[PDB]
Enzyme design. Structure first.
Site, PDB file in Angstrom:
ATOM      1  CG  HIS A  57      -0.284  -0.137   2.515  1.00 17.86           C
ATOM      2  ND1 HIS A  57       0.803   0.631   2.882  1.00 17.86           N
ATOM      3  CD2 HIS A  57      -0.534  -0.960   3.561  1.00 17.86           C
ATOM      4  CE1 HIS A  57       1.183   0.291   4.098  1.00 17.86           C
ATOM      5  NE2 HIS A  57       0.396  -0.678   4.531  1.00 17.86           N
ATOM      6  N   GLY A 196       5.641  -0.366   6.024  1.00 14.30           N
ATOM      7  CA  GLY A 196       6.705  -0.836   5.174  1.00 14.30           C
ATOM      8  C   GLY A 196       8.044  -0.961   5.853  1.00 14.30           C
TER       9      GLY A 196
END
Ligand code: NA
Ligand code: NA
Ligand code: NA
Lengths: 245, 55
Positions: A57, A196
């Site tokens: 994402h 992330g």
């Protein structure tokens, strides 16, 4: 010369919301992911001189590598240090089964240094044991706490999916390719802008990348641990993208 | 109940947006969650801009 998972600056190892400011460059695999416009929106984990691991994402706004800039060796978020590296992405590789993980090719392989070292990868399908204390790092939102604008760390126990999926916690949302981590009372958690980035667990010698910061219900709430992609369920895919590229 | 109480799963990305209450939300998902909650609908909360308010 160097090897993965071995910081040349000893981490602080605190008892990102909560946690503390990290000792500068004790997490040398921590990446700051920025748009061409050059502003931090996601973390990342260096896997090898040319490759980065991040959450999918973080990439769902532009499919073009030219739109991404990975910042290596940083401690401050805005006033980057003089040694810091600024390498532009050349390729992006989305996990094929629509999982929240992805790989970035670096146009110029970053040079390994006392402040820029990659993390080690787990062995396939390894399951981090319940209550294992791991570390999460990043520049993300701080909520009421200190250290906004600097790299933070937080030491957090893994909660086995079985418990994490109980109704009073995350109620069936987590499943096999993810792991949970956080304190039952809340107050310490990754948060927006940490996506992330790495969740690493020390193993004898070195830190092993076991999770990728992914999602949660808010941040640092009681009974709501953070959810991370389970890196071990994907190593066979990561190597191939490096191997076959 | 969880949607109504503003309890939603959201990525931990920083992609700030601006609500009609002049508050910056750290990403669209978080704003979407408050918009659909009781307290957001209470205040006719909506998204005004695709960047931080005032940035
Ligand atoms: Na760093
Ligand atoms: Na911050
Ligand atoms: Na888990």
């Amino acid at each position: 010369s160097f090897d993965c998972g071995k910081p040349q600056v000893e981490p602080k190892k605190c008892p990102v919301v909560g946690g503390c400011v990290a000792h500068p460059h004790s997490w040398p695999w921590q990446v700051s992911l920025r748009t061409r416009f050059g502003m931090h929106f996601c973390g990342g984990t260096l896997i090898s001189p040319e490759w980065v691991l991040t959450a999918a994402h973080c990439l769902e706004k532009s499919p073009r590598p030219s739109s991404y800039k990975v910042i290596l060796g940083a401690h401050q978020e805005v006033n980057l240090e003089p040694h810091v590296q600024e390498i532009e992405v050349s390729r992006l590789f989305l996990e094929p089964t629509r999982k929240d993980i992805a790989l970035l090719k670096l146009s110029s392989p970053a040079v390994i240094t006392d402040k820029v070292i990659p993390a080690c990868l787990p062995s396939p399908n390894y399951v981090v044991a319940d209550r294992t204390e791991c570390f999460i790092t990043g520049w993300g939102e701080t909520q009421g706490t200190f250290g906004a604008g600097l790299l933070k760390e937080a030491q957090l126990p893994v909660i086995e999916n079985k418990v994490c999926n109980r109704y009073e916690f995350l109620n069936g949302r987590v499943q096999s390719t993810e792991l949970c981590a956080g304190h039952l009372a809340g107050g310490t958690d990754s948060c927006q802008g940490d996506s992330g980035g790495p969740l690493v667990c020390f193993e004898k010698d070195k830190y092993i990348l076991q999770g990728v910061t992914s999602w949660g219900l808010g941040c640092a709430r009681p009974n709501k641990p953070g959810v991370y992609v389970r890196v071990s369920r994907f190593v066979t895919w990561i190597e191939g993208v490096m191997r076959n590229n | 109940s969880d949607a109504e109480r503003g309890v939603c799963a959201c990525p931990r990305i920083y992609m700030p947006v601006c609500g009609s209450n002049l508050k910056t939300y750290n990403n669209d998902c978080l704003l979407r969650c408050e918009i659909n909650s009781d307290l957001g609908r209470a205040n006719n909360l909506r998204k005004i801009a695709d960047q931080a308010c005032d940035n």
